[PDB]
């Protein structure tokens, strides 16, 4: 299970390399146990080579409310959130029980290990003994949603309640809602990505089209990422996504994170230099040029919180300019760098910058921009709509800018 | 996988008792999944010998069996029901549990079950923790023994489960009525149940002390209930609580195939006791009855002499059983071990002593030989001094001459200078085996 | 190795560069006898650069791969040398070994030997040392070179008790005349034997420069022979130094099928440059040759069309090939590769660059893509903006343009305002394949 | 290494002979793993019992003993000399081997070296094949003998490459000199080098009759070479062979550390030699020198004492060793074997014979117990009945009285009334030990 020098190579997966050389709590929608077993099950075993601890948690699927409104015992939703009865506990009990071990051995008919959980967890507090146990033996621990009273009564408890639970107690890297529906819809109902909590939580309440029912389960997924690290993410798409939605480029599901506060201003002195001068010379190989920062004319400039990521602004010949845009290692990780630039590109639709050619964030830059001249040792880019003229000019003055970091 | 399976097979074939091993568990493999043996263990030893039984545990399993355990937790509940300040109550029972008391058992019958798995994996095995999930019982007792239940139902899916997984089965002894209340189990009702549901090869109770005792204080190797349980209980000399433990062993043996037994050992015997004929520890069995007689016409010598044969290696000589003149014969019922004595110049001489290694590992040859020293108080007898066999007769006798050849030994308080005349007619008898 | 494969081949069953991993590793699985690499490793790589030379040839293990290992001297044997004796040389270079510089070299290249065979394994891999035994030779006129030899036979005894034990021969160049006397072997005399016994189909240089430097000085990323070697034999830029080991590769190659490659770059980049079609490093083949025409009926059209459509998902609009007005075309003469150029408005405009993935893995796009910039010094072209040669693209552009479906690019000396137009043009261009 | 060291010994801790195991792999648990043993294979063991050799050594190595192995394919190549012809000077006391022989007697080691690795690896275990670089020599006699060598120097790199590996290191017996000429190396010389270099704790040697002979036949299991070796050398039956093994396995033992030793024994006993105190070869060491005197003042008793104290668990009564009256006292220099012979009514007595089990499993109690039984033909002894040692005692006797606490044990040629006479005497005896 070496294998972390061996993708030192590649692409996106120096990301998880560094948390693989440095877990996720999975919510079943139980409309999906009954469904695709395998696939669920093929999901979770791959989740666990790639060193995430599977801990999941299931309820009971429409299979159980029909096996309950067939036995003349409706549940009904309680006119708050579920689990309301007494003729049903032994029903719940089995349709939970036999659901539970069905998981456990599907996984283990995909390549995984697992561990039946179906019940001493969830109390009506949390006993992790057993997880902790099933961690301990790299062990996916299938969670039944089956809870007890103190003196041991049986009591169906809330998916909610449970997960929020054992999400504070675990404190996991990842949080995973499997649904049928896999992804918040956005304006024209379309599937909204990416969520960036603390930087459009404040929109989103606001926002008229989003209903009661996002409306409130966007303040509980708040609750879950604010009670964690900043590292932390809520992935909410469908089990045949999981994969291409836990790290890499695609994920049609949805990424809630918590974000962090966004600094955007023109006031040189409100912005801790020294902080900006560590973030450079970390970021690139090499420090400032002596007197860079007392030079430097702000235009904007858009830092985030944690001083890992920022993009400074200036101003050439009226034109904006981007003079300086650095990002921390691990903070690409919880898409800080994204964060800034997107800020940045949204109060400056046209641009110029430029960036020596074997820096290696140049295909970023290619990607990016609607235009470069390339040259020996630099490549101007612009973004935005002009004349060749006008280019033509302002692009000689970008490759006439005096270098401001040293070194190679 | 591949290096575990793998190098304990080209491992132990060049141990001593490797051999030995092999064969048993080969011939173990009676799987039937969980068939292979619910291992019994007390709290005590959970506590007091944790590294060990794991240990024990994980050899049985990383040499091919599956052993359901169930463990209760006596000390455990004491001390943690103590620190909480519930007291016990032993009514006409074993014990009360009030709500009050339940929430402290469940954490500590949890506790005990998880370490337990925990040190099985430590020591390189595999094991589930099934606290919860198997036993469903009533309450029957409400008023009277608060929240203790009788197991009405077997629920083996978790058990099944692990086994498939390979991991031994570790069971705490807790369960749950029909409506999901939580429940305090007996430890004895909960392995009957779950013997019976299983109806496993072997039973294994894993003690401190390791075995039940005689009437001298030492292990009393094996006990043929056929023939020894009726003597057992009408005998003044065995002690109440080892009179209890007899009959529920008895109990449980009952409600099992032949082919089933019991062991007791502790847990660094376990291994010596499940895979060599000597074992160590009680072995107890159902067993078969025995015949004795002194009449020759009412044995089937032709079974006989398949079983002399078969002991020894070579056959009887010729005219050997239509010659023998037959003071008493011992045999048991299946002819797998025999003792039968004739009369040299008066005595009473054990002319053939003949056991199959099978039954030598059951323990009939200890059955037929006790009641046959039962019967002859003073006994002569030879053996080559090559049979293995030396040593038990060594511990049996009360005198021995060696000789370069032969051995006699004698048994009964006589002095040396009254059988030496029949020693030297011992001597000088033929050969009753060809080769 | 349950342990090892199908984990790395579900982090590549579905990924990015992980398409073409996936196929590598297919065919590198093809004959693992040890006709998979000759690996020959400078004498100083193994000083400098010694933890991560161990910890590149140990992946190629983990996933699989066997190569056989080939060490020098070098910096080794100068210092430990002359820290006795003045050494010498006479034969174009195969230094000299008087008689009594013996002894050092034994031990010298064993040293090494075992530094390498222990970092290997400290780094996770499987190596055997094998610093004598595999070269056979002869004393080449004693009285003047001394006790250096030439390859008479190679026993691969020893390499084979190593593709069977699945570690990594690590070879000494230290060999033995026909009656046991030992013999010093020249390092790449030394290689040209293993390879022309092992039929490789790679075989890799390490070295600390990752590679070798094309005019302008970068890793010049390959060299197709069919075409290159002229050009780069009667070369003004490439000094005498460069044309020994252009030599020497060539020589190696041709002794080898047209599928095999030599490959020098850096132990850090080994595995970029073995799993990836864009590798890291120089690689270099036999190759294939191609026409440069500007006549239309000497093409095959359906040949053309075929690939077009195999490169992209779709074939040419009806009546493309039909109304196409070549410029130049440029065609590897397996048609696995081709870039045709039309003329847009007094431009050279590059209509169809099409490439098999197999050929880009080969160095072919490159051959066909370089001899084509050379004939069109400026170019104008476009591409899908989700296009992946659009990294390429980049790579080889002086400038560029992107909107939503198209980008344009071009080469030459221009700024945005001598193509301005042209570019305009170019996005208004019709699609020229299906949809 | 820790990882699997700890799951192999939690296998072996139940096993019968788990703890003797388990206590080698401690013993050679870092970095020396090739200093556990040098074991020399005889020539023929590998042409006929070839597949049981490799799965021996591969019984080793799978538990994480690394042996260095050395082998000199002694009648197939003799055969193959046969073959190319030119075979037969043996001048001075070894073998000479010509020019000629040399690249054939190299082949044919080189080859059964490969089929050794090979077997190794088949049956299951990890083999490094070192059939040259090892054995440095100068060349012997150059004209009487030819190309023959003396080992010079011992280059144990590639070895401990091996070791290090986890493989077990099979070497052949071919030298080379300073100036790189490839040599012909004795196979007994070989292993003195490679043993003087190495130091191991075990030095082993395959035979396919596995195992030494005393007087009568049976197998002589072990020799304690400080008591042993003269008589050894001057017995009739001792004949030339064995007397040459004897000089050579002296040698080895008198360069080796107190706690190395010698086996000689068949591949499919090696498991039972290393790891038990029975097995069909011979083990010896250098061993103890020992004391047989009449002379109590000449013992150490506070010691004897303490030995009495640790054999059985209690100490002798209070005036016990003012009282005795020795008959003889046999000692064993360390005072972990003694056996005291007193005088009852007459007869020769065994009042004490106390053996620590460390001396027992080095063959010490054999070595007093023999020389004692030797002195005294006619043997009285007891023994409580619950006493381990007591299996021991009914396979020395002649004849043996059992009653409920004691046990007593004559041997000799002896009539009924003489023996129930001194037998009745000896069940009298009060107890020498406090009681338990
Ligand atoms: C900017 C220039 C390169 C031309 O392009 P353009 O017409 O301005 O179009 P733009 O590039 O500004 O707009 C599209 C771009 O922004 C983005 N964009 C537009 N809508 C988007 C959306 N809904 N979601 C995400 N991205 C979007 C794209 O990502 C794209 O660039 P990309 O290909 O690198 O991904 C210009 O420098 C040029 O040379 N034009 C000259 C003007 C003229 O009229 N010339 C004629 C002869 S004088």
Same mark, same amino acid.
């Given at each position: 299970?070496?294998? %972390?020098?061996?993708?030192?190579?590649?692409?996106?997966?120096?990301?998880?390399?560094?948390?693989?050389?440095? #877990?996720?709590?999975?919510? %079943?929608?139980?409309?999906?146990?009954?469904?695709?077993?395998?696939?669920?099950?093929?999901?979770?075993?791959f989740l666990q080579t790639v060193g995430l601890t599977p801990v999941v948690v299931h309820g009971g699927g429409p299979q159980?409310?029909?096996?309950?409104?067939?036995?003349?015992?409706? !549940?009904?939703?309680?006119?708050?959130l579920?689990?309301?009865?007494?003729?049903?506990?032994?029903?719940?009990?089995?349709?939970?029980?036999?659901?539970?071990?069905?998981?456990? =051995?599907?996984?283990?008919?995909?390549?995984?290990?697992?561990?039946?959980?179906?019940?001493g967890v969830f109390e009506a507090h949390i006993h992790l003994d057993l997880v902790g146990s099933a961690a301990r033996a790299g062990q996916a621990a299938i969670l039944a949603c089956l809870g007890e009273t103190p003196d041991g009564t049986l009591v169906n408890i809330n998916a909610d309640v449970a997960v929020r639970a054992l999400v504070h107690a675990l404190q996991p890297y990842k949080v995973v809602f499997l649904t049928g529906t896999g992804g918040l819809l956005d304006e024209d109902g379309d599937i909204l990505s990416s969520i960036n909590l603390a930087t459009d939580f404040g929109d989103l309440m606001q926002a008229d089209w989003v209903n009661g029912g996002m409306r409130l389960k966007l303040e509980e997924i708040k609750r879950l990422l604010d009670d964690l690290p900043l590292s932390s993410s809520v992935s909410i798409t469908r089990?045949?996504?999981?994969?291409?939605?836990? #790290?890499?480029?695609?994920?049609?599901?949805?990424?809630?994170? /918590?974000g962090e506060r966004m600094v955007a201003t023109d006031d040189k002195s409100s912005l801790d230099?020294?902080?900006?001068?560590?973030?450079?010379?970390?970021? #690139?190989?090499?420090?400032?040029?002596?007197?860079?920062? =007392?030079?430097?004319?702000?235009?904007?400039? #858009? %830092? !985030?919180?944690?001083? /890992?990521a920022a993009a400074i602004t200036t101003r050439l010949d009226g034109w904006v300019y981007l003079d300086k845009f650095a990002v921390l290692d691990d903070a690409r990780g919880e898409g800080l760098g994204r964060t800034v630039w997107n800020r940045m590109v949204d109060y400056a639709p046209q641009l110029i910058w430029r960036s020596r050619t074997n820096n290696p964030v140049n295909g970023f830059y290619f990607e990016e921009c609607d235009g470069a001249v390339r040259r020996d040792e630099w490549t101007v880019f612009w /973004?935005?709509?002009?004349?060749?003229?006008? %280019?033509?000019?302002?692009?000689?003055?970008?490759?006439?800018?005096?270098?401001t970091l040293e070194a190679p």
């Amino acid at each position: 299970q070496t294998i %972390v020098q061996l993708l030192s190579h590649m692409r996106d997966g120096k990301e998880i390399r560094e948390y693989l050389h440095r #877990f996720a709590v999975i919510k %079943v929608g139980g409309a999906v146990i009954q469904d695709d077993l395998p696939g669920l099950a093929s999901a979770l075993a791959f989740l666990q080579t790639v060193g995430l601890t599977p801990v999941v948690v299931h309820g009971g699927g429409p299979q159980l409310d029909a096996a309950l409104e067939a036995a003349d015992i409706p !549940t009904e939703r309680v006119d708050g959130l579920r689990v309301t009865r007494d003729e049903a506990m032994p029903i719940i009990r089995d349709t939970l029980t036999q659901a539970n071990l069905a998981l456990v =051995d599907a996984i283990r008919d995909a390549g995984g290990r697992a561990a039946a959980v179906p019940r001493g967890v969830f109390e009506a507090h949390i006993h992790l003994d057993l997880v902790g146990s099933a961690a301990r033996a790299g062990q996916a621990a299938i969670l039944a949603c089956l809870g007890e009273t103190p003196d041991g009564t049986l009591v169906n408890i809330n998916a909610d309640v449970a997960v929020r639970a054992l999400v504070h107690a675990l404190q996991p890297y990842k949080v995973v809602f499997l649904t049928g529906t896999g992804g918040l819809l956005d304006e024209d109902g379309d599937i909204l990505s990416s969520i960036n909590l603390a930087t459009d939580f404040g929109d989103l309440m606001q926002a008229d089209w989003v209903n009661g029912g996002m409306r409130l389960k966007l303040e509980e997924i708040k609750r879950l990422l604010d009670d964690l690290p900043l590292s932390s993410s809520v992935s909410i798409t469908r089990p045949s996504e999981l994969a291409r939605e836990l #790290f890499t480029h695609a994920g049609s599901g949805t990424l809630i994170r /918590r974000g962090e506060r966004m600094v955007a201003t023109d006031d040189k002195s409100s912005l801790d230099l020294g902080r900006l001068d560590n973030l450079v010379k970390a970021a #690139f190989g090499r420090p400032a040029v002596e007197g860079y920062w =007392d030079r430097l004319r702000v235009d904007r400039a #858009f %830092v !985030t919180e944690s001083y /890992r990521a920022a993009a400074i602004t200036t101003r050439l010949d009226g034109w904006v300019y981007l003079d300086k845009f650095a990002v921390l290692d691990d903070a690409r990780g919880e898409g800080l760098g994204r964060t800034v630039w997107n800020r940045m590109v949204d109060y400056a639709p046209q641009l110029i910058w430029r960036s020596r050619t074997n820096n290696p964030v140049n295909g970023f830059y290619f990607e990016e921009c609607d235009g470069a001249v390339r040259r020996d040792e630099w490549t101007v880019f612009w /973004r935005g709509e002009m004349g060749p003229v006008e %280019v033509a000019d302002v692009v000689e003055k970008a490759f006439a800018l005096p270098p401001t970091l040293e070194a190679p």
